[PDB]
Amino acid sequence: SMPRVDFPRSRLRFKEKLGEGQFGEVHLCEVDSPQDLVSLDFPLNVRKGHPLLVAVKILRPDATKNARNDFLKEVKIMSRLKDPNIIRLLGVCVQDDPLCMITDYMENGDLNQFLSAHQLEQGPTISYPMLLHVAAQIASGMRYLATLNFVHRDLATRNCLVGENFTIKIADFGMSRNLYAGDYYRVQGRAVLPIRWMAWECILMGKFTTASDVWAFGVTLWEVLMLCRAQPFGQLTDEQVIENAGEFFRDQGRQVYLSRPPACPQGLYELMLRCWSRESEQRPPFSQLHRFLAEDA
Ligand SMILES: Cc1cn(-c2cc(NC(=O)c3ccc4c(c3)C[C@H](Nc3cncnc3)C4)cc(C(F)(F)F)c2)cn1
Numbered sequence: 001s002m003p004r005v006d007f008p009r010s011r012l013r014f015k016e017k018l019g020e021g022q023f024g025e026v027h028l029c030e031v032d033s034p035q036d037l038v039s040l041d042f043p044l045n046v047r048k049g050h051p052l053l054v055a056v057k058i059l060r061p062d063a064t065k066n067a068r069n070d071f072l073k074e075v076k077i078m079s080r081l082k083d084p085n086i087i088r089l090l091g092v093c094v095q096d097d098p099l100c101m102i103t104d105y106m107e108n109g110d111l112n113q114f115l116s117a118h119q120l121e122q123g124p125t126i127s128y129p130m131l132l133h134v135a136a137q138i139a140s141g142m143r144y145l146a147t148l149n150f151v152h153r154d155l156a157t158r159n160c161l162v163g164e165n166f167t168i169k170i171a172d173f174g175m176s177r178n179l180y181a182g183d184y185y186r187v188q189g190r191a192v193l194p195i196r197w198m199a200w201e202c203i204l205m206g207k208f209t210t211a212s213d214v215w216a217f218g219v220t221l222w223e224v225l226m227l228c229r230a231q232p233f234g235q236l237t238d239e240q241v242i243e244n245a246g247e248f249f250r251d252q253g254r255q256v257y258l259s260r261p262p263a264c265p266q267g268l269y270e271l272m273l274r275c276w277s278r279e280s281e282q283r284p285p286f287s288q289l290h291r292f293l294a295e296d297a
Contacts, residue, residue, distance in 0.1 A: 013030040053107070059097075115224065139286050156220055196231065198215070211280035
């Protein structure tokens with residue numbers, strides 16, 4: 001943790017359960033007069049007498065030593081991350097049970113669900129420059145993580161949350177949602193990996209770097225431009241995805257690239273292809289990616 005004191009528990013008014021997991025639950029709560037509890041570098045846009053909505057992740061009160069240790073590890077990592085496009089840890093309750101971590105609340109859910117409910121410009125719609133701005137926010141969030149020497153290792157639209165006015169917050173749900181079980185591949189009956197988003201060198205040698213995050217961003221950019229209508233490499237089985245990673249390693253031109261999304265102009269698709277360069281050093285840094293997406297595209 002980075003908060004010096006526990007967030008006062010009595011200031012969280014329960015509104016609604018947001019989900020239940022093996023280790024606990026997530027509650028939507030209200031906080032009255034939050035100015036004295038909320039860090040000054042975080043925006044408060046509440047009318048007089050209106051409360052701030054926050055998300056509270058609560059660890060089961062009978063959790064194991066291990067699950068409790070995992071929970072506190074997640075708290076410490078989140079306490080470091082202060083950026084307009086990264087989920088924010090607003091407070092914690094860790095001096096007594098049950099353990100709690102309080103995040104800002106992104107009322108529109110994860111980005112994959114959000115884009116699925118939009119059509120390209122009926123129901124709710126979204127246009128090409130708005131999709132560029134979504135991806136630019138992700139790139140901006142990732143550029144910040146890179147400056148911390150922090151490797152996300154699971155960037156994908158399912159791990160981005162959407163607030164008001166299309167604001168994007170990068171997050172990490174872990175691998176704890178049945179909805180996305182198909183996006184992970186179990187290796188030798190133990191760990192689970194997001195192979196369709198991983199660079200060939202993550203698949204084959206287990207090396208995770210900002211450079212492989214750049215690769216993942218390219219797949220995530222492809223998702224955004226597809227409006228999340230299709231799993232990346234959907235035509236390939238998991239074993240074919242792993243074989244495709246062999247083809248990248250051999251670089252004989254038999255490797256398979258994701259196709260240009262219909263809404264994607266050629267110059268932008270060419271930028272995506274550079275995120276999948278075989279050499280880590282030839283992938284563009286996030287600073288270059290954000291510049292292109294916020295301006296040149
Ligand atoms: C060991 C470890 C931990 N992390 C890590 C952990 C995180 N954790 C989260 O993103 C997180 C935490 C708590 C809650 C949620 C998400 C959903 C829910 N709030 C919610 C709000 N609004 C709408 N729905 C739901 C409660 C994030 C990251 C980040 F930022 F780097 F990506 C990294 C990496 N390694």
